[PDB]
Amino acid sequence: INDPAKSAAPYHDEFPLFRSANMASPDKLSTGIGFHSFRIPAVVRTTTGRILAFAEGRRHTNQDFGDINLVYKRTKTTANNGASPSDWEPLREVVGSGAGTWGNPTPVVDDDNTIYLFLSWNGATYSQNGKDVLPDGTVTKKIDSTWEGRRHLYLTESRDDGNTWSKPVDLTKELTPDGWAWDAVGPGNGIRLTTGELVIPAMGRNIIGRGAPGNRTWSVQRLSGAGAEGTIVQTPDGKLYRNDRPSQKGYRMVARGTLEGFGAFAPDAGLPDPACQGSVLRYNSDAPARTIFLNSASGTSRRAMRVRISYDADAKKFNYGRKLEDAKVSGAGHEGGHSSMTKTGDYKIGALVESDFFNDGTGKNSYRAIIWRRFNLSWILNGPNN
Ligand code: NA
């Protein structure tokens, strides 16, 4: 019942980290290439303490298809914990080749500090639904099972604390089942287990990394009833926990297991979700062991962001937690959507959260920004709705 964290001084601060084209000082690459929207956050802390924040740079509209580059920012130092805007480097690019889609960033930090980044890719003229109009009037083909038309799975890595990245290597044939069309990895993060393996959540499956850090052998763990956009965590009991986006609005879909297999997925009645990506973080295993979860706590809206704590050895139940709106950001639109969480070096939680200006309503011209938040456990625990 007791948590010493509640007695600590509560701490929170927050600011836009990826600034859309409509904002003052919009984020652009050194080449001058700019972006209508930033969506699909992912964040990890490396073994040095540096924080790496990734996003999809959606060039022309907020849509999932078309020219989309994989962008990122690092903290300028390994020790600043991204505490203020001046602590963050300017926008950089992992990969932006062609006019197709580079996205679904799903990083994991390995023991040697190799940072692996799993990505999804699709071609310039394809979209999930097909028949979508591109900025030049071109109508998309529907993503299909052909080599040119399917979703690919790519892997890149950094050996220098995120400073540079390898040209992504196509692992589709090795790590995506044959005959698939649509695919997704993450988005959000993979994990490293107490037992040494890596686990990367993907559509219908986990990707497992074994062997030498930064030199892993990869394999596929097929799952029954998993979602397209999954999250993974090792719960305090040492078991695995998939907490996935549902296909229809309702509740997060949860399954538990090990590297030998998972039980059935079932909705978690305690975690409503509007059919949107969420994030999960293993905080600590010593008493009192904690798992952190973040999503929109709503069956209908993405604007109900709520960070929560579970003390359960199997993360069966999360507390009410705290609404992010208790510490709202002004000037970056309506917060809510995808999220990704990391621990920081100064005993805080760092979270990236989508925001939507909604200037074009549900339309393609609605600018999307990404907020960076830091808060401690005390902040969560001192929420008025617990
Ligand atoms: Na591009």
Q: What is the DSSP string of 226-255?
A: --SS--EEE-TTS-EEEEE--SSSEEEEEE
Q: How close is the Cα of 201 to the center of ligand 1, in Å?
A: 25
Q: How far is the CA of 126 from the centre of ligand 1 (A)?
A: 14
**What single letter denotes the amino acid at residue 53?**
A
C-beta separation of 245 from 275 below 8 A: yes
Lookup result for tokens 């790519």: 154
- Centroid of ligand 1 to alpha carbon of 102 (angstroms): 7
Q: Give the Cα separation of 214 and 212 in Å (integer).
A: 6
Distance 70 CA to ligand 1 centre (A): 9
- Which method resolved this structure? X-ray
Count of CA atoms in the C-beta half-sphere (13 A) of 79:
0
Selection from 299, 296, 318 nearest residue 308 by Cα: 318
Q: How far is the CA of 36 from the centre of ligand 1 (A)?
A: 13
Interval between CA 300 and ligand 1 midpoint (Å):
33
| DSSP 3-state of 200 | strand
Q: How far is the CA of 216 from the centre of ligand 1 (A)?
A: 29
**What distance in angstroms lies between residue 100's CA and the mean position of ligand 1's atoms?**
6
* DSSP symbol at 135: T
Cβ < 5 A residues, ion ligand 1: 67, 69, 96
381 Cα–ligand 1 center, Å: 43
**Joined tokens for residue 381:** 């625990």
Resolution of the experimentally solved model in angstroms: 1.8
| CA count, 13 A, side-chain hemisphere, 163 | 8
- Across the beta sheet with 334-343, the strand order is 12-18, 368-375, 349-356, 334-343
Which two tokens mark 359?
Answer: 């200037």
Q: How far is the CA of 97 from the centre of ligand 1 (A)?
A: 5
Nearest to 233 by CA among 272, 286, 189: 189
Domains of the chain, each with CATH number or no CATH? 1-386 (2.120.10.10)
Q: How far is the CA of 28 from the centre of ligand 1 (A)?
A: 13
Dist CA 272 CA 184 (whole Å): 22
Q: How far is the CA of 160 from the centre of ligand 1 (A)?
A: 24
Exposed / middle / buried, residue 32 (Cβ in 10 Å: 0-12, 13-18, 19+): exposed
